């Protein structure tokens, strides 16, 4: 028991606290700009007529 | 996977004869069966058809009356029964498989054939521009395809086939729909229209690419052949 | 649909919904029974009796042109509240307790009370199977006793409509009730009339334990059309 | 254990020392989606009990659906024709996954088994292929990386990683407490998250088959993930009526998207192909379609019984859903 | 104008009654059950009644007289026959039903499926038409009676039914004897186990019975007692037993349909 795992928990989170990281502000503007860089290739957002989509009637 | 034909023979006119197919190595009783008929001098012809649940058949214009289709699925047997012979039904019959839904290839398995002796209108026109062409191993090969009426339908299919019957042995399937290629046949085949017009391509050029090439149309019912294109090499 | 194709298509559709009609016809006429006990209790021996790392097992049984499909729930973890979910719909639960250990009956009484009051259970009546109890009587007229780990036994009389068996010597039906008691005040205390318990005093050599589940069974699914039907 | 709970603390200061500014800050000066009227345009019908999962098909007209009466369907979401229907040996199944490549299907449930049907075969029927055995719990969840690699998710709070032409797990993923009910890829297949029972969700690495992140934050237990069409997000689902959306780089918990007017929990989640959007099924009988970067109620997609599963299409043309009643409804 | 009033309160809440039913059950998906068919077409015959029937059949009442082509009188009575026997017939196949839910638990959904219910609703179509339109097209009815059939009714403008001696009790039996006992043996047994099951852990079927039976008697007694005694009820007392008739296709919609609390909804 603590003769091994204890001996594991140390291990996997003292590998886990290395990480790079980031300004969370910045996160915030990759999923914006995919958002508007996308925006016109979503059928769901801007409604289609019923002339190009396959599920008319 | 194997089918097996019996019957032939030769009739004397006025007869009546039962041919049969076989089927073994599959599930039978989930694939649509056809007959396919072929002079020994002209190019194939397509005879009736029954479906997997015996609830729908059609027959050819030319024999209505005469012939009568039957299905066994216990057994795994097709019968096709034929009345009053007369001086036409000279030729060779085909039994094939045929499986119907989204993204299927249907004509895809053909048996051997069987012979047959005897003693002495608004359908879709399908023609091909020639006959025949000689060629090099190595060289690329054009075949054409017309029709006489559009192929394309609203949904956005184009219902165009290609079989290229060796010299000997059963037809096979080449491209099923105008554009998709069959299971195992090699990645040097293509094909490519515009509604009316068709033509089969061949990159490279083996040994084995030579025969007959045909060309069958499955929008309306009588299901038109075309005549064939020879290849000498 | 105005091609060949499409029609062949709705007709190999229309063969899949007569496939799938016969299907339910099978599937409206079956019974389903899930069966929930311990490593100590006989449940593994009444299966024999009515007939690799796997989840779950099946047995079949008949009776009067009935089939019923009791499901044993295999080789799992400790935890049942995540995988409890998908048997809202059975019939019945049956429940076996080995209640001739002295030792290994409090578990059990947490047990039945986890499975009653579970929130996923309601509407799921339960058939209580008391298990091994020619043992209990070879381990009371020696006399291990009771008292030394339920104090109030010593305070409990036989209650006044009980049925001795023929060959009944005095003392072990006392003994008997009070844990049959014990297992009745759980179900008692909730429940609001929407599911009951059904206890029983089941033995190792056994040939009725089928016709048991049988008409309580059928005492249920009755209630449960009465009370449709506003006649309840 | 003293100096476990130092780093812990460690962690987490490294954590607090980066939230400059929520995404509400930034994104509270962008005009909303406003409203969205999404209505039903087939209905497949034919199952018998309820239904418990669904995958779309990458050709964005296939489908495969999983029930409890032991049978599996694949529509055609065009015609509302039915292509197959493919019976179980056990008939308590749980999850369905669809091959990239059209060949495969799998599923599984209570039997620690994990089935591979092949539909492309030389005769006309479907047929198991491959039973992929060595799981101590039942199957919860499952995904094809290609035609030859599978990755399933367990009861036995371990994930594993198979190789279908020899059976044999090629990677066990050891680490949650409790048993685990979800998982999600990558667009990339080189990484994805695990959602399990213990209320914290996983990053793993399939080629070093190592816990790469730890994220938490939820007051109950997991019921469905998903990963951000991008490839930097996930957002998970719990049985509290929440439901968050963290970054894998930042490391924390951006917005969070719930009401108080919900009080069941959540069962499925999914994506718009632009992000734009974030809908989930709950249990009062509905699905809530919810702005993803503002936080804002829009449409509501109003089944008889819980819904049970989601799935939006690849190209973004439709949404199928499906729920307790045995009933597949799509909307566009 | 208080007795048009009536008229109108009656039909236009048995329309109100059957309407609104019919619409519940085919398009909500929930409500698809064999027995659930049952009471969709038994709410469509009653709407017939409504709007044919009750209009035309009120006309005569009112004013005392008839004013139409005789063609037409044996088509307004056989369609009035037809009906009510459908109804009654619904009734009694809806009771069956419920003796078989509840007197046998364990087989019920295997026996009671979409197959029986079809054939119920079959049959309970397909004989009265039959019983109805020979009976009244064929004159069987007016044999023996010819002289007093025309002798007072016929010359004065009239289009009142009139049976003889055989065709009155048969009509009596077919139409009043059998249902009317087999919803009576049915709810009885019913009565016994339900409460015989209460002690252990009893209205709705008293009410139902009291229902039926209070509106339907009297019109059949009088029908078959009447040519025994020698044709002595008055017209307008008959007419009224017509519209207390009548009166049972206005509530059979609201018991076997509000009561039950799954259909609240
Ligand atoms: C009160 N309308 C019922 C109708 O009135 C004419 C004779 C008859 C016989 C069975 S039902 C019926």
């Not at chain 2, 019996?6 to 056809?34: D, E, I, N, T, Y």
């Not at chain 4, 914290?200 to 993930?225: P, Y």
């Not at chain 5, 059950?25 to 049952?38: A, E, G, R």
Request: proline share 3%; net charge neutral; aromatic share 12%.
């Amino acid at each position: 028991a603590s003769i091994a795992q204890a001996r594991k928990l140390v291990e996997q989170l003292k590998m886990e606290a290395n990480i790079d990281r980031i300004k969370v502000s910045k996160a915030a503007a990759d999923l914006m700009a995919y958002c508007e860089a996308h925006a016109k290739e979503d059928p769901l957002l801007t409604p289609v007529p019923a002339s190009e989509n396959p599920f008319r009637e | 996977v194997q089918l097996v034909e019996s019957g032939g023979g030769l009739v004397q006119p006025g007869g009546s004869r039962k041919l049969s197919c076989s089927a073994s190595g599959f599930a039978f009783s989930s694939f649509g069966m056809h007959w396919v008929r072929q002079a020994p001098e002209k190019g194939l012809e397509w005879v009736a058809y029954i479906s997997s649940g015996s609830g729908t058949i059609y027959y050819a214009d030319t024999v209505k009356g005469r012939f009568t289709i039957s299905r066994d699925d216990p057994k795994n047997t097709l019968f096709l029964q034929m009345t009053s012979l007369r001086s036409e039904d000279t030729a060779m019959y085909y039994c094939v498989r045929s499986i119907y839904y989204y993204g299927s290839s249907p004509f895809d398995f053909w048996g051997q054939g069987t012979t047959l002796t005897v003693s002495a209108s608004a359908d879709i026109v399908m023609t091909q521009a020639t006959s025949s062409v000689p060629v090099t191993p190595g060289e690329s090969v054009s075949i054409s395809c017309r029709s006489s009426k559009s192929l394309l339908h609203s949904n956005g299919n184009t219902y165009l086939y290609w079989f290229l019957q060796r010299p000997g042995q059963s037809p096979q399937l080449l491209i099923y729909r105008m554009s998709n290629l069959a299971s195992g046949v090699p990645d040097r085949f293509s094909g490519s229209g515009s509604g009316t017009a068709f033509t089969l391509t061949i990159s490279r050029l083996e040994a084995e690419d030579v025969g007959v090439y045909y060309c069958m149309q499955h929008l309306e019912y009588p299901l038109t052949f075309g005549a064939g294109t020879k290849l000498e090499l | 649909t105005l091609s060949a194709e499409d029609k062949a298509a709705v007709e190999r559709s229309k063969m899949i919904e007569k496939q799938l009609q016969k299907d339910k016809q099978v599937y409206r006429a079956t019974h389903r029974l899930l069966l929930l006990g311990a490593d100590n209790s006989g449940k593994s021996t009444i299966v024999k009796q009515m007939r690799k790392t796997s989840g779950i097992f099946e047995t079949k049984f008949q009776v009067d042109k009935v089939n019923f499909h009791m499901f044993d729930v295999g080789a799992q973890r400790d935890e049942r509240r995540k995988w409890i979910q998908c048997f809202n719909d059975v019939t019945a639960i049956i429940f076996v307790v080995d209640s001739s250990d002295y030792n290994r009956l409090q578990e059990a009484l947490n047990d039945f009370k986890s499975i009653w009051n579970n929130r996923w259970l309601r509407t799921i009546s339960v058939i209580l199977f008391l298990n091994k109890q020619d043992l209990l009587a070879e381990k009371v007229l020696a006399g291990s006793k009771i008292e030394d780990y339920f104090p109030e036994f010593a305070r409990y009389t036989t209650p006044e409509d009980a049925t001795p068996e023929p060959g009944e010597d005095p003392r072990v039906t006392r003994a008997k009730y009070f844990i049959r008691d014990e297992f009745l005040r759980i179900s008692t205390a909730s429940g609001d009339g929407r599911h009951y318990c059904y206890p029983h005093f089941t033995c190792s050599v056994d040939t009725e334990n089928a016709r048991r589940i049988f008409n309580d069974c059928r005492d249920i699914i009755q209630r449960m059309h009465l009370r449709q039907y506003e006649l309840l | 254990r003293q100096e476990a709970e130092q780093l812990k603390n460690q962690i987490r200061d490294a954590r607090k020392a980066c939230a400059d500014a929520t995404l509400s800050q930034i994104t509270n000066n962008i005009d909303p989606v406003g409203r969205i009227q999404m209505r039903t345009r087939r209905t497949l019908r034919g199952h018998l009990a309820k239904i418990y999962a669904m995958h779309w098909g990458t050709d964005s007209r296939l489908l495969v659906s999983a029930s409890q009466d032991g049978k599996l369907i694949i529509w055609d979401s065009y015609t509302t024709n039915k292509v197959h229907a493919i019976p179980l040996r056990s008939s308590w199944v749980m999850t369905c996954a669809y091959a990239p490549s059209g060949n495969y299907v799998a599923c599984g449930g209570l039997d620690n088994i994990c089935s591979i049907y092949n539909l492309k075969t030389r005769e006309g029927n479907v047929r198991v292929s491959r039973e992929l055995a060595g799981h101590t719990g039942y199957l919860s969840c499952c995904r094809f990386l290609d035609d030859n690699q599978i990755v399933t998710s367990s009861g036995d709070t371990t994930c594993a990683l198979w190789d279908i032409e020899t059976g044999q797990q090629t990677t066990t993923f050891t680490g949650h407490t409790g048993d685990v009910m979800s998982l999600s890829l990558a667009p990339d297949t080189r990484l994805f998250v695990s959602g399990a029972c213990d209320a914290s969700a996983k990053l793993w690495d399939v080629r070093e088959g190592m816990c790469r992140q730890t994220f938490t934050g939820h007051e109950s237990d997991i019921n469905a993930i998903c990963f951000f069409p991008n490839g930097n997000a996930f957002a998970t689902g719990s049985d509290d009526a929440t439901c968050r959306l963290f970054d894998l780089r930042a490391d924390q918990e951006l917005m969070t998207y719930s009401h108080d007017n919900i009080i069941c929990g959540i069962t499925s989640v999914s994506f718009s192909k632009s992000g734009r959007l974030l809908l989930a099924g709950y249990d009062d009988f509905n699905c809530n379609v919810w702005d993803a970067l503002k936080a804002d109620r829009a449409g509501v997609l109003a089944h008889d019984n819980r819904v049970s599963c989601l799935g939006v299409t690849d190209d973004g043309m439709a949404v199928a859903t499906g729920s307790w009643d045995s009933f597949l409804k799509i909307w566009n | 104008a208080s007795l048009y009033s009536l008229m109108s309160l009656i039909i236009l809440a048995t329309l109100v009654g059957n309407l609104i039913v019919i619409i519940s059950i085919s398009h909500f998906k929930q409500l698809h059950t064999p027995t659930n068919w049952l009471l969709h077409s038994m709410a469509i015959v009653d709407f017939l009644l409504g709007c044919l029937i009750m209009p035309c059949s009120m006309v005569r009442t009112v004013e005392r007289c008839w004013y139409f082509g005789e063609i037409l009188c044996k088509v307004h009575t056989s369609t009035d026959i037809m009906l009510s026997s459908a109804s009654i017939f619904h009734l009694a196949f809806i009771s069956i039903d419920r003796y078989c839910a509840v007197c046998d638990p364990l087989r019920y959904k295997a026996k009671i499926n979409i197959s029986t219910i079809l054939v119920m609703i079959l049959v309970s179509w397909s004989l009265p038409a039959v019983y109805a339109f020979g009976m009244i097209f064929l004159e069987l009815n007016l044999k023996g009676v010819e002289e007093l059939y025309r002798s007072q009714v016929s010359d004065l403008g009239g289009c009142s039914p009139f049976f003889s001696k055989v065709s009155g009790v048969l009509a009596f039996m077919t139409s009043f004897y059998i249902p009317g006992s087999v919803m009576l043996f049915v709810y009885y047994r019913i009565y016994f186990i339900a409460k015989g099951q209460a002690r252990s852990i009893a209205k709705t079927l008293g009410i139902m019975v009291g229902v039926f039976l209070v509106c339907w008697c009297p019109f059949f007694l009088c029908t078959v007692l009447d040519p025994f005694l020698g044709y002595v009820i008055p017209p307008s007392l008959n007419d009224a037993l017509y519209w207390f008739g009548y009166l049972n296709s206005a509530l059979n919609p609201m018991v076997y349909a509000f009561f039950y609390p799954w259909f609240r909804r």
